[PDB]
Structure 1
Amino acid sequence: AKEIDVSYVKIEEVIGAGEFGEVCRGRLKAPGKKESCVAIKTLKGGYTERQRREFLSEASIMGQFEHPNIIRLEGVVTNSMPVMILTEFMENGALDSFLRLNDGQFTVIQLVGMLRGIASGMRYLAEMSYVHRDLAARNILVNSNLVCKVSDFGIPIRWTAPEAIAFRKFTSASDAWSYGIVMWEVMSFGERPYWDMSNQDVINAIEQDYRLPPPPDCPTSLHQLMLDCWQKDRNARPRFPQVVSALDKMIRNPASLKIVA
């Protein structure tokens, strides 16, 4: 629905590499509108015709959404080559590597505001009956004001709920499990979940009631919220409306974030 003329894009600088090509920063400018900043995903010569429709599957599903915590589709370039998806440019890049860079350097309140934006984007996706399946801190992007936005549209054992591993039943409740792992990643400044362990070590521990402990300095009520998301029984996990309001309660009552083991 958003076919964009190729003379309207100036590619400026490579900034990353997604699974099927380079990712660049750039400028978009169409007649009658302001110039804006965009990220540009490309797919260069040499690919199948179902590989092309899977690249562009990202843009079709992404053009469905409109929410301040979901990355925006500016448009596509298909009628020519190279093929392109244009999205919103995100100054502080991926969330896990942004926090490792900034380790120990943001307040609990700021970290909670990140998690509340991600939960809000999750709450909106669940309301539209879209199940993400790949929620992880590496698929959340951060802009100049620290606003967090879910990307990656279109299995990661340690982010995935038990019943989704065993039976391939992927729901919003299994996304809630993945969300609790994102809480842990955020509160541990981008440490890798289950550090040392292998995928089968992780699965064996979970089935045997092991759960990631609180990160150093982590409020007790954030950890409980993680443990609520990690219940074996998928129907006892909080849904995302409940998650966002638990976090809102923390932000209005910041004396509850001072208490720790």
Structure 2
Amino acid sequence: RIIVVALYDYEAIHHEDLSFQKGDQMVVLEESGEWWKARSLATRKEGYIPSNYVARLETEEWFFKGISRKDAERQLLAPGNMLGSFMIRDSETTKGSYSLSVRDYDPRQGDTVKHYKIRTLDGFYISPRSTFSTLQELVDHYKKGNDGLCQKLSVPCMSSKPQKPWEKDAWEIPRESLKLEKKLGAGQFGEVWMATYNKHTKVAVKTMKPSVEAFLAEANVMKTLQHDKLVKLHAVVTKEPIYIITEFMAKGSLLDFLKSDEGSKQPLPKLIDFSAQIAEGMAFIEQRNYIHRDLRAANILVSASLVCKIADFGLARVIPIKWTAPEAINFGSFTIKSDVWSFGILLMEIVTYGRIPYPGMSNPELERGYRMPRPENCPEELYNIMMRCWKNRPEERPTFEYIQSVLDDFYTATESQYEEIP
């Protein structure tokens, strides 16, 4: 007898899925991954529901599960929030513990987010003097007054409806299910379309010009590489020409967005954030021991809410020298370090708002030790990161883990990560 509650509103759009509202209790009948079979207690109907839409602490309006410090910082500084906006989350360095992230303001620094460790007793407390038995007592307390905090607690961080999962057992789909509506891009190997799946789910389809099974297997490799900074691979059409179905990114490629009007209005910390998300994705690729082979702003997608994701890596294997490292050009040796070089070039693209890497220079001719000069708006240390990425010896290039760690806390000293309260 398992009972869960709905965290968000969900309207059914399939044959056997259920419609429920925020707060509706339900009885779990079967747990089958992204989709569970359950029975509503309000409608008494048995059907399918998305797992990530229900919980059995998560039910609290001020708790956010599985999110990092940087993620909290991003979601709190997002539009729709104010001073005092806060959240309680799973600690990222203290496994099993919790942390509080609060939005603050201060001149000369702008809008910020402070983070406080929450210590579990052997109850909870931020300050040893003021202790609480439940987290709800903590939040209720600090909503009354700072009491040591950077700011008085106000309203929980604005919750965002999660991504609707792909329908069950729909990895291989019939072509008739798709209506390719608007061509977004074309190339030598195929084209890219904005399309609709079964009249309900907007997706992006990549049509591949005409081995079948081997490519299919490569796609089966890609499908298991799921990450928030990697484009979600939903479905595939098997009959030629092969269609690759992925999630739709509203603002398209990072290149086009940076060259766009809205992109030119994006400040430097936002660019740093973009490249930090890209670095995180490439770090996920790095930990899994894989290779992108073609890292550029053109191969990075941007969601509607300004989220940068890595797209279509590994497709290159089934087949850009300015983004390519010397060790990969002269000897065809492609490794993660060449991806680091490529990431340096990408960094340069992002700071220069999509500008061509070596302007005025043709592909031929680096041997004289020439590196791109630092742009006027580019920070010296960021340029230092670029230079570290552009090193002749591949083994002397930084890891994507380290690069991500540096870019994430680019404006924060290590000591200033979590505020200390006596």
TM-score for the superposition, normalised by structure 2: 0.53
Q: Does 1:97 align with 2:261?
A: no
Residues of 1 paired with 2:223 and 2:251: CA distance?
23
Q: Does 1:37 align with 2:202?
A: yes
- Match in the other structure for 1:3: 172
The answer as to whether partners of 1:56 and 1:85 remain within 8 angstroms in 2 is no
Residues of 1 paired with 2:206 and 2:273: CA distance?
28
In the TM superposition, residue 60 of structure 1 has moved relative to its aligned partner by 3.3
In the TM superposition, residue 19 of structure 1 has moved relative to its aligned partner by 3.3
Task: Give the number of the structure whose residues are more often helix, by fraction.
Answer: 1
Residues of 2 paired with 1:115 and 1:66: CA distance?
19
Residues of 2 paired with 1:58 and 1:187: CA distance?
33
The answer as to whether partners of 1:112 and 1:251 remain within 8 angstroms in 2 is no
Residues of 1 paired with 2:182 and 2:379: CA distance?
41
1:92 is matched by which residue type in structure 2? Answer: K
Match of 1:28 among 184, 197, 206: 197
CA pair 192-36 structure 1, distance change in 2 beyond 3 A: same
Question: Where does 1:1-261 land on structure 2 (aligned, <5 Å)?
Answer: 2-29=171-198, 35-43=200-208, 47=210, 50=211, 52=212, 56=216, 59-78=219-238, 80=239, 82-102=241-261, 104-153=264-313, 154=315, 156-201=320-365, 206-252=366-412
1:59 is matched by which residue type in structure 2? Answer: A
Aligned residues: 239
1:89 is matched by which residue type in structure 2? Answer: F
Mean Cα deviation higher: 142-151 or 8-17: 8-17
Residues of 2 paired with 1:138 and 1:106: CA distance?
18
Q: Give ranges in structure 1 of 5+ residues lacking alignment.
A: 254-261
The answer as to whether partners of 1:62 and 1:72 remain within 8 angstroms in 2 is no
- 1:10-46 deviation per Cα after TM superposition (whole angstroms, max 9, x unaligned): 332222224333321122249xxxx3321012246xx
CA pair 229-73 structure 1, distance change in 2 beyond 3 A: same
2:236 is matched by which residue type in structure 1? Answer: V
Residues of 1 paired with 2:347 and 2:391: CA distance?
15
Residues of 2 paired with 1:73 and 1:183: CA distance?
26
1:161 is matched by which residue type in structure 2? Answer: A
In the TM superposition, residue 207 of structure 1 has moved relative to its aligned partner by 1.5
The answer as to whether partners of 1:188 and 1:216 remain within 8 angstroms in 2 is no
In the TM superposition, residue 62 of structure 1 has moved relative to its aligned partner by 2.3
Residues of 2 paired with 1:18 and 1:61: CA distance?
24
Cα RMSD after superposing both structures: 2.3
- Match in the other structure for 1:256: none
Task: Give the number of the structure whose residues are more often strand, by fraction.
Answer: 2
Residues of 2 paired with 1:82 and 1:104: CA distance?
37
2:332 is matched by which residue type in structure 1? Answer: R
1:100 is matched by which residue type in structure 2? Answer: K
Q: Give ranges in structure 2 of 5+ residues lacking alignment.
A: 1-168, 414-422
In the TM superposition, residue 184 of structure 1 has moved relative to its aligned partner by 0.1
Q: Determine which structure has more spread, i.e. the larger CA radius of gyration.
A: 2
Residues of 1 paired with 2:231 and 2:271: CA distance?
19
Residues of 2 paired with 1:242 and 1:4: CA distance?
40
2:327 is matched by which residue type in structure 1? Answer: E
SS at match of 1:26: strand
Residues of 2 paired with 1:99 and 1:114: CA distance?
11
The answer as to whether partners of 1:22 and 1:42 remain within 8 angstroms in 2 is yes
- 1:150-206 deviation per Cα after TM superposition (whole angstroms, max 9, x unaligned): 1133192111111122222211111101100000000000010111112222xxxx1
- RCO comparison, higher one (Cα < 8 Å, 6+): 1
SS at match of 1:74: strand
